[PDB]
Amino acid sequence: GKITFYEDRAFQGRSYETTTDCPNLQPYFSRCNSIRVESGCWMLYERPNYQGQQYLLRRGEYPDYQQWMGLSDSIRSCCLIPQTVSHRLRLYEREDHKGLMMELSEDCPSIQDRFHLSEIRSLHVLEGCWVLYELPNYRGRQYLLRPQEYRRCQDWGAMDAKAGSLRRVVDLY
């Protein structure tokens, strides 16, 4: 998909567009107080090199940042995620893929209500792309889960192991 960024509200200020990833948005802009995801699902980042708080911007026109109830203006990196035909994830109680393992192929609205874990140490996305969320109801700090074996929370750029909910990435056209 494709996206456009605006540092000021009402689709105003510093305007930049991309159709691919960009780990360093610094020479372009530092923030985005209004944003138009033309298509796709884009994992925005607070900090460059894919660090800090992550932000799932879905396909739509957001006339300001509070429209999707975001955390902070800080948009200093971006990731494009394509369509994924299937989804299979494994939640591990301990890091380095140990302890209680639990597979998941569905959208979990709240892991604490389901498998009673509010924090996950390590993951293994067998196939597809997922997104971990800090809070249930798909809220809080987002965390892009990519098709691989996550050794620990440090892998996907999590400063902590918090896991409120889980959802499977689908491409919105």
Curated annotation (Swiss-Prot):
Protein name (Swiss-Prot/TrEMBL): Gamma-crystallin C
S-methylcysteine PTM sites in chain numbering: 22
Keywords: Cataract, Disease variant, Eye lens protein, Methylation, Repeat
Disease: Cataract 2, multiple types: An opacification of the crystalline lens of the eye that frequently results in visual impairment or blindness. Opacities vary in morphology, are often confined to a portion of the lens, and may be static or progressive. CTRCT2 includes Coppock-like cataract, among others. Coppock-like cataract is a congenital pulverulent disk-like opacity involving the embryonic nucleus with many tiny white dots in the lamellar portion of the lens. It is usually bilateral and dominantly inherited.
Pfam family, any one: Crystall
Function: Crystallins are the dominant structural components of the vertebrate eye lens.
Signal peptide: none
Domain Beta/gamma crystallin 'Greek key': 1-39, 40-82, 87-127, 128-170
Repeat recorded as keyword: yes
GO term, biological process aspect, one: visual perception
